[PDB]
Design a protein around this nucleic acid. Sequence first.
DNA 1: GTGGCCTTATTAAATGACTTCTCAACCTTCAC
DNA 2: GTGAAGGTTCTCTTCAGTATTAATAAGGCCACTG
RNA 3: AGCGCCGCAAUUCAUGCUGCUUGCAGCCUCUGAAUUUUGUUAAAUGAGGGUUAGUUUGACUGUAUAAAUACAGUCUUGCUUUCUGACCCUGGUAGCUGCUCACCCUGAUGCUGCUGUCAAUAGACAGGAUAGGUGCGCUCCCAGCAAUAAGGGCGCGGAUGUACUGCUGUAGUGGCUACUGAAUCACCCCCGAUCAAGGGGGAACCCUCCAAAAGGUGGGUUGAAAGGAGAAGUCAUUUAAUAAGG
Lengths: 164, 602, 87
Amino acid sequence: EAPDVKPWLFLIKPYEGESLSHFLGRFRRANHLSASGLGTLAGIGAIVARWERFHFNPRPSQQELEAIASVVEVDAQRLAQMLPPAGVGMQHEPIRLCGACYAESPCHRIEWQYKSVWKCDRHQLKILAKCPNCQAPFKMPALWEDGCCHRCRMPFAEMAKLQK
Amino acid sequence: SSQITIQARLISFESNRQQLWKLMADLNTPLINELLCQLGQHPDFEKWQQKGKLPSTVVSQLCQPLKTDPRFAGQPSRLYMSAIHIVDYIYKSWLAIQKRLQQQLDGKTRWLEMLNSDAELVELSGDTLEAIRVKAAEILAIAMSLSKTLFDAYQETEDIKSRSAISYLLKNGCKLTDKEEDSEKFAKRRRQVEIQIQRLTEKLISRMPKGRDLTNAKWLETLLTATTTVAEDNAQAKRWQDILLTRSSSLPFPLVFETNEDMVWSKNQKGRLCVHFNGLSDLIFEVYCGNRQLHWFQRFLEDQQTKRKSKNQHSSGLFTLRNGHLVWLEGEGKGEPWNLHHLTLYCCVDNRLWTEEGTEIVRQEKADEITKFITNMKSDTQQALIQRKQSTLTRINNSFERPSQPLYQGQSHILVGVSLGLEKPATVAVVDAIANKVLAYRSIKQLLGDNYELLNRQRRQQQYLSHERHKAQKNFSPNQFGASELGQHIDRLLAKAIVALARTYKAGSIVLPKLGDMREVVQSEIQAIAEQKFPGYIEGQQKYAKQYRVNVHRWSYGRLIQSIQSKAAQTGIVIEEGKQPIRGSPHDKAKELALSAYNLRL
Amino acid sequence: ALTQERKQEIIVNYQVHETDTGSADVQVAMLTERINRLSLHLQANKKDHSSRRGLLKLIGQRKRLLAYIQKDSREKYQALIGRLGIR
DNA sequence: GTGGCCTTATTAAATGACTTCTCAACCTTCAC
DNA sequence: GTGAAGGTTCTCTTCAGTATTAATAAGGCCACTG
RNA sequence: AGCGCCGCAAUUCAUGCUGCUUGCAGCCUCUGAAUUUUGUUAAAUGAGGGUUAGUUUGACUGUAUAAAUACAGUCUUGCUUUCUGACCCUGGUAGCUGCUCACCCUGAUGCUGCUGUCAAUAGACAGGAUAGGUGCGCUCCCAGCAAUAAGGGCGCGGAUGUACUGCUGUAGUGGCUACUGAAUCACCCCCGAUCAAGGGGGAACCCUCCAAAAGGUGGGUUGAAAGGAGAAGUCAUUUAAUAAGG
Ligand SMILES: [Mg+2]
Ligand SMILES: [Zn+2]
Ligand SMILES: [Zn+2]
């Protein structure tokens, strides 16, 4: 062993509005974990691959968030802030993006999936629901490694000027 | 199980059939629907669920003001009475189901609390395992019904040592065990109980009895709504879809005639047996039956004529006919419904009333029951009830002069055990219990004899017809069929074979296993395994052992038990219930089932 | 089934402009024609569960489109449902 | 043999099964 | 005045439920190492 | 290949057989059990759809008997089912209507798979359950297709505030309605009934019997079984739609 070392893992700081799908994707990339791997590591199994698609029948339970809060050092109350608050309706399929936010903070925001959200009040821009250059839909936020459209390679920060 | 049904087609000219159809479909079934609706809204409905019992008269009281409502007013008195009986039996059924399910949920919730692992039992007792093992040995030596006695002992003994010792003693099947607890087999056994509690909790969200709307007005108005109106949200549109997919009820509720003399039999000049019903004597229906049942319908006339010749000095309490159901059977093709559908009468008879010796059995059963009633029962109408009961008790002594057939005599020491299994539906052992020897085994193949090929046919058709339905569903084709009638045929062939063997060896009884609810056991066992194998993957869990779970849901152990009970009662062979051992082959299970039922006689 | 002439007449009547062929208003007008004809069919053909499967799809499709239009503009939405005769 | 992937819910229908409940009877009244 | 239709009561259900002996399993592709 | 089924063969055996001693010891012809192989000119299974109020599986009484049942007489009705035979089909003519498809890749409990005339394209005509693979069969496998499982890729047009949409034809494939074609049967034919209805006439084989070379009275027979039903709830499987779940 390395003497006086504590068993450790690569951590990531969650951004102020980062979605759980985006967060788990970064944590998985930081540790080169497959989606099945993190679920086995937390012991919740295949559930992680389901959450990364925003498939929330059922929602992330107290048990499973506290389980993920054992391998991720982020506490379960902060993990619950990566999800819609109680009774806020959300949509999983059309993945959406502000772009002007992504130039400031490279994360998907869970509020971009709310059924009540359509503009960024900070930027006063209509949030995108597909790539404005090539019309390809955005991939699940767990897969936003490159920070660009997977088809035409336009960076999300440039898509800010193609909004509203 | 001496009650059986015999049936016949009822034939009449069209205006009689049309008049009856309109009474049933336009008045009687709407009345039943209204009674079901009002009864499900009654302020005592929630306390009826707690008792599990309906008040004896509440349906009759609700029907009284409806008998003169313009929606329902046009019916004979016995059709209102029939509607009352339909509704009353529906809720007697439904409240009995809910009551037992609730007791099951409460019982297993207590078991989940008192199912503690030895690691938990060490902390919760504060004693070493050997110390609680000794304390369990004492508590067993006092409780020496043992299971219930330990469940009784657990509740009020707040002493956590004895309480834990009872928990340890119950975990092992009411006995001591030296061997160590396999922690994963315990965790699985705990998980099974949680699944069972959850599945019981879900079954207790049963719907109230839905009725039969024959107009389907709700479907058409929902169609007009959903096509011309914006849905306020997804939940309204889903409720619209759920209505639009609901299939229409074609047929009214049958009529029920609980008074056997409300069917009045006659023979027309063309020599055919005829019947008319109280309140509808102008509608003569002609009996069209198989000869294999004709002797019953002839008996109904002879019983009626006997009591008329004696000026009612006989009792209809010994009439072979018990009650009738009047049913429309769905016809193939097209027409007006009174022409398309075939009117059918189902008569309950008690098979014992065929013979004179069996009638004497029923007479004593009637006399004891009525003498008990008259003694315990002691208003003007309640005194009239006593007088009718006393008239019955007097008149059942008058004989109908029925065919004499000496009752079956079976040796008390000879038993037939019937092992029931998923792979081998029945296996029998004839045991001479005082000798402790098997007189005969028979396999499933020997029981079916020349019919044994039907058993492979059933398996083959169940596969084939399921796949043809699966293919037909994707086309929205109506041609969806199944093997239920072949399965019923097989169970009746087995029942006759088992009883014939019992007669041949002069067995005193047939022993059948208390299987319990095999489907909920298997379903919770497999789910507990699958949740370990496919953690967090529901579809993987549901695919796991899917065909075994299907096979267990098709296993017709209840239908086979029922067929055996009926055939044994018609020959006067006693049915006994025993515990089927899990060890051994179907032959050994049948032997030990038989011998345990003998030893369990006390 | 729908004729090309009735189809193109729906396009022309609900178009936002002469080359608009796919705005949500045109889509709900197309679906409203289909739903009206199929409702008349199912009133007569209750056992046509194959065709009933289509209705539940078509009603859902129009429900999603109208909900989309309504939160673009209640003025356009209310005007549109009034023209189509939808409550 | 390790490892990744595999979404989950409701309601209706068909089929196969399971369970529960029921299976009176004498008397009165008005009609030829 | 024999037959038809119609009336009437039948109670209480604080009881029944909860334990074993359990079977080898019931998962199938792909790729990738060892 | 895999899986299910079928028989075959083999071993062991008792629910089989043999014996005196009636509880035991042999044996493996019969009748069965335990699943062990194996697919053979074998023996068994075998799933395209449809067709009868079809026949037999009855009731009572007497006689016999150890039950089981059997014989004789009288009566008989047609219900709901399970098989075995035999027979008929591969449908037609108008309407209504769903789903599917820009294109490409993958290929699903996807679709299709017979014979033989003709026939380059196209299918038609006549046969017909012998219907792709094995003993038989599958959702497996083979071959073609695959838009009508899921996914993935990627055009121009509309729309772009979360909805999505067009590329889509005498098109492919389902469903519903009306009318309509064949068997509409139990040894065969013909004429009828179908909420009642049966009638006529034959063919084989066997009894009964003139005293008889010969045919012919009086009848019989020509495949079997099973039955407790209604009502209400529930579970499981599958299919379809919807939703992203208070
Ligand atoms: Mg959407
Ligand atoms: Zn922004
Ligand atoms: Zn792009």
